[PDB]
Design a protein around this ligand. Structure first.
Ligand SMILES: OC[C@H]1O[C@@H](O)[C@H](O)[C@@H](O)[C@@H]1O
Ligand code: NA
Ligand SMILES: [Zn+2]
Length: 227
């Protein structure tokens, strides 16, 4: 059958899910405007709950399969609060970047051109897709996040950060060991390099990255041997 030219999902797939929003849901521009008036009565981050992520045609999509980085537009919806009653938003974005943020729990966050959103609970329709978050891309975000904030980090510091990071339960991920990192060494170093080559001291040069780059060149078993 025919595919969506945005996300590649089959239109006639019985598992295909569309985004839903309550009738009073508004635009990101509408939401941010209303908000300006409320603080008049500056630019904080938002909590976003009962959230969904989708392509421009409304197909529910993964955050982490490369769509964003390929410059395919991902839109999102949910109930937003600036930062424990929210405002219903729909077709927010697109997402320019997703990232990790923190009590030792690493939460998914989105940047649009206008605002930042910390993701709380998925909508029940989105939950199984959010649940398919991969270990390697989440680990990558943790790595990138940890090295931005700690430019002098050693490999031991990194493994510690990884081992103690609890994924939120919506991600449906096991706790991480040193093996979680080692098994994805190559993917991780590609992600760190990609981050460095994209914007603006590079995290690729951090002492612990030197170690990871080297471990990326050895068989998985031999990486483990060095654990
Ligand atoms: O750690 C959280 C921060 O990560 C950065 O990479 C993003 O640009 C910010 O939007 C975010 O607040
Ligand atoms: Na998962
Ligand atoms: Zn689509």
């Amino acid at each position: 059958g025919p595919k969506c030219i945005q996300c590649g999902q089959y239109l006639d797939d019985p598992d295909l899910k569309y985004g839903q929003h309550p009738p009073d849901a508004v635009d990101e521009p509408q939401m941010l405007t209303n908000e300006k008036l409320s603080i008049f009565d500056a630019l904080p981050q938002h909590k976003l709950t009962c959230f969904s992520v989708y392509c421009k045609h409304g197909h529910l999509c993964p955050i982490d399969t490369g769509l964003i980085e390929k410059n395919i537009e991902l839109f999102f919806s949910g109930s937003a609060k600036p930062i424990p009653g929210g405002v219903n938003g729909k077709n927010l974005g697109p997402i320019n970047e997703w990232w990790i943020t923190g009590g030792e729990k690493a939460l998914i966050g989105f940047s649009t051109s206008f605002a930042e959103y910390i993701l709380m609970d998925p909508s029940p329709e989105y939950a199984p897709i959010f649940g398919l978050m991969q270990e390697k891309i989440y680990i990558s975000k943790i790595v990138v996040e940890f090295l931005q904030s700690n430019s002098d980090s050693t490999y031991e510091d990194l493994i510690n950060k990884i081992e103690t990071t609890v994924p939120p339960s919506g991600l449906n991920l096991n706790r991480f060991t040193e093996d979680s990192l080692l098994r994805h060494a190559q993917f991780v170093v590609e992600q760190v390099e990609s981050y460095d080559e994209a914007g603006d001291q590079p995290i690729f040069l951090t002492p612990c990255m030197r170690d990871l780059i080297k471990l990326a060149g050895v068989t998985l078993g031999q990486r483990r041997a060095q654990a």
